[PDB]
Amino acid sequence: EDLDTDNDNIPDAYEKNGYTIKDSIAVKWNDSFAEQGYKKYVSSYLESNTAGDPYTDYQKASGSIDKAIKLEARDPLVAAYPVVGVGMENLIISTSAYINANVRYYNTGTAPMYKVTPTTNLVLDGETLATIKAQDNQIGNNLSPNETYPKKGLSPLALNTMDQFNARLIPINYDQLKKLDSGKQIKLETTQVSGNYGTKNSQGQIITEGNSWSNYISQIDSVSASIILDTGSQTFERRVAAKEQGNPEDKTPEITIGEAIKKAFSATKNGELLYFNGIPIDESCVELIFDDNTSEIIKEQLKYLDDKKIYNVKLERGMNILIKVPSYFTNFDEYNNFPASWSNIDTKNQDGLQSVANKLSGETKIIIPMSKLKPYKRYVFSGYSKDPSTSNSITVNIKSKEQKTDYLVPEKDYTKFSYEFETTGKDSSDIEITLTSSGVIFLDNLSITELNS
Amino acid sequence: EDLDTDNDNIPDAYEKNGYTIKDSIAVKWNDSFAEQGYKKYVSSYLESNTAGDPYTDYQKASGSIDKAIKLEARDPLVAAYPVVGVGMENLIISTSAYINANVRYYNTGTAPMYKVTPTTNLVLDGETLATIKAQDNQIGNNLSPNETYPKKGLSPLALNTMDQFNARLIPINYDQLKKLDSGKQIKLETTQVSGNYGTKNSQGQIITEGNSWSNYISQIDSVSASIILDTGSQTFERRVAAKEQGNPEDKTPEITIGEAIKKAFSATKNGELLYFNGIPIDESCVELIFDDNTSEIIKEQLKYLDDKKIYNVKLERGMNILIKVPSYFTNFDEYNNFPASWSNIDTKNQDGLQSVANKLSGETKIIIPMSKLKPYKRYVFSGYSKDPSTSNSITVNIKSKEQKTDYLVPEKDYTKFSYEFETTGKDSSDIEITLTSSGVIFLDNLSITELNS
Amino acid sequence: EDLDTDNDNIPDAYEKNGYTIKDSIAVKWNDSFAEQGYKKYVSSYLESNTAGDPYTDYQKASGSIDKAIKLEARDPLVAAYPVVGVGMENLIISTSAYINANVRYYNTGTAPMYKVTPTTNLVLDGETLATIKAQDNQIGNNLSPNETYPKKGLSPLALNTMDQFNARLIPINYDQLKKLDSGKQIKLETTQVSGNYGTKNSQGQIITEGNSWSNYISQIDSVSASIILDTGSQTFERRVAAKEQGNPEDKTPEITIGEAIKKAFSATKNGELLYFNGIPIDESCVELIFDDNTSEIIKEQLKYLDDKKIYNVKLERGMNILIKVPSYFTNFDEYNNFPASWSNIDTKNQDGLQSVANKLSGETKIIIPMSKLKPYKRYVFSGYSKDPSTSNSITVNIKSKEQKTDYLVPEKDYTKFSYEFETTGKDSSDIEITLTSSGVIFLDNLSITELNS
């Protein structure tokens, strides 16, 4: 109808159901609008800023905001939130002594952040040497998403001043140098970052002076769940709005984990498979990492669902989700990046997850060279196994810093198994993997994924 | 009706009685609204800000305030009040000499506090070495309730500057080092903290510039009673509005201590039992600590009440209440965390406080290992005893720094007994507890609670 | 009609089709208006600022903006965007030691930029010595396009102060001088530049105080493609607005690469040939340099087009295009700047690209003196070859740092061939070029172009 409780130019009936923006006006969603390229939006009819960002639902949906904001933040359920961190490129120490850093700022959010003023800590071993706020020489005027300051091809900015105006960074005593010579080196971490956001005033100009991102950080972090996606080299962090559990007046729409991922990362869905930029981010092709609360919530909710899939679990406020695209992934259909081919593989099957499976009759042993491996790193080998007989056990031998010999009992249906090991030393013993089964098994989606060192 | 004396969008009749917020409008409370999850609110019809905070009754009730504010502060009788303290994580001294601290700020209130600027004192023994206000490098942009700055996983921020811009902390003379070498160490206490609160302006943005928390601290502290709850590791401080005694024009609603606790901490009530987060905070399961004025007020009011319970005493302005969840608690029904089982215990009874009691025929002696004990600490052993005969006396022997031998005369009904002792030295004599009675007694709710060292 | 969705004084029908400004009002475009000197403008009817600059479509089209802005930015599809860089004219080092620079700012954009405050890095070899922001003494009040500060005839401005107020630039230790004496010299690069833009207020005056160019840099860079033109001595950088691919609500007009170049550089078109300032910038007379993404996009789009020309490819958002006017260019019609004439050239032909071709029967060898050559530089020799027989192969011998002997198979129609070599040392061996073919070939548009050293 024409009822607007929160006065954001979108009718309450349109917000409760689907709606789309055409010619800068909101209209009812129709299933025939998807082939033209339109997207269906849903938002709370009792709140103008469903996601908690400075931009209302209408501004996000109609694209009436800064054009450097990523389109993923045009969804009213996805918050435009800059994530900025400081990377320490180089360290210089020279005479007490003086210390200097070459650093570069990174942005992994959905919104640009003007006037970047990071605050950093200098910690050697537990003890924090100094806390430094960015001075006038170390302030970035612009920082667009998926971009750095200084940009690519430019040297990292210098940091040598402790306080305002002119100052020199200096350890308090010779003990710092004494423990530096022993073999202890210095970290750098970011405690907070200050910056501005852009709005259009009554004169049509863009102002970024009185608009502070710190006025919305606590609000966004309290009404949303965090989803992080790592692709080995690039990382993307997103916040998705979720409804309150015990609040009856909370009208935030409810979406699942897969729907939230698709909304936050704008991943193309080809019927059922989900692709980010041609890289499959489907549930069975990636590693999912959760904290204790999210893990227990998902385990509790899974038993009440017949499908029993992570992507079908309703998103809830306070969730932290990490997605790790496997470094090595083979499915015997369209991708096999392993430098060395597997042993005793039969592709003549039709019982696989997507197209076919691997009919293993005996054992499979793989020799992985360490040239394409990262030393001093923890890895996880994951896979999907199928055994209708449920009478054969699989024993696995993994070569690592400590030799691992483990046993597994496959189930009737496809079951995921993951084994964690650690590799230390580049010029060390070669990594060997072996798995032997009593009879004939089905294997699919074998992955090697890096974890924290 | 439609009479609004204070002009806060809530009718006076609705405020005097119960009311609830539905579709952003206030409506009469109905007993059938509780099963939908709604809450009943009451507030003064002669004051827009009943609790004394910057947010009016309508804004609190309808949730038109900053979303990082805890839901306990959505009650008009509970004030959104940040409680911020500075914890001194590490101390570094090195050459006169120079001193540096690694500190972290903590928030235990219901509202976020922006631009945290604490003021701290450096006291060694009585004499205050220096008073330091937080500089630009030591200011926290955001500080959400139940969160720290820097957040978990980040090193504590450094403090080495005395005055504005650039300065070095330094003792005035060698006497400081002379008495430091003797074995005297340095404390750190917070005298005041400066910060901002968030409000939405006419343009829909959030501004935290001219909004100071110091404009409301004295007002809140003068029209409210303080309730603190300690759970061994976490502490929560709340302020609950109370009416003036001699003022006839004060229309603040009157609530009891149990109702105030439930409102302030959002504790679930399962008929009669009260739980915070699964931890029972019922009157008989926790330790209640009061100052002299509150103690005498409660003792005076108890004699005029037939029920004779602390939680049924009307809350009054100026009250200070402390709740300490017992470290060890046994009730013989659903909880027994004592590492060593009790002696001569008979659970076959039906005269207990909730389900059953302990039928002790003789004596009970418990040997508590000091591995799960805190040395150099004062402890209290509390319990509930019942003796219909009223002819048997109970003598208790408690091993501590000084051996305690005390006598008790149980009453006809259940009576609470508390004994205070001190344990000194980790590698000291083991703690022994014994209590002997002439005949058969009923024992329930035995608790061991830590006190100040 | 009279429908204005974005309220920029231009009807939507006029924006969708062509329109022109007459007597400060927008009117329908007519084909008879071109002979009077009028230009046809197109812009999005759903956005007031199609290009993303602080000036709306009407202000750009009608010339209601600062008069120092170049007329190329009067097109609503071309953004008024200043490009400012710092050129290091001289370096002085003298005693640790002190360092001073003589520098001059350059502007290669379409808009003037007031209050220029560049930020620069001092890098010797990887390590960044210091980052310096322009102080009060090094700020340029005005910087017009194609102009410098200080202007021509004035000495470059001095830079010797590191921080605010008064400071002296100084290396941290003697290691800087130690590696300077070895033969390592210092670069200077610009990380960012701050400045203002001019707008007219309600009183008719021009204000450049609160108008910051950093509020529009990220917006312009995200909705436009960059085109750079280098003419050996002068460089011009432009941004041309392009539409979003997947957005159905993006109404930005679509133009080709040649049309975009003509719009951005105001190049006169004499039917088909395109001239910048009498220098032909036609597709076959210049070198086109693309990044990987633009190269693959253009290759993909070319196969779907019958004409198969770069200038007919539709411009797309995110494109980076570089145009290099060849240093030496001969076409046997109206231009031959080679100091030494070619060998075995027959101009009696009528099958050339524009007027005639070169009928080569045998081989062509050219001796190019190094007096008009730049030592330690990489060069490219390009040309167009035609062979209807398609039975003769052409072998080329190029003298350089390494002697190059390459083979080529000409096609039936005109085909472009490019060969890259490097010349090192002014007092080195003379450069020789030779190319021999089995039979009779057609040669046209022979060019020598400088590349990066």
Ligand SMILES: [Ca+2]
């Ligand atoms: Ca609405």
Ligand SMILES: [Ca+2]
């Ligand atoms: Ca809404």
Ligand SMILES: [Ca+2]
């Ligand atoms: Ca498969």
Ligand SMILES: [Ca+2]
């Ligand atoms: Ca009222």
Ligand SMILES: [Ca+2]
């Ligand atoms: Ca009121």
Ligand SMILES: [Ca+2]
């Ligand atoms: Ca009991």
Ligand SMILES: [Ca+2]
């Ligand atoms: Ca228009």
Ligand SMILES: [Ca+2]
């Ligand atoms: Ca327009």
Ligand SMILES: [Ca+2]
């Ligand atoms: Ca020609």
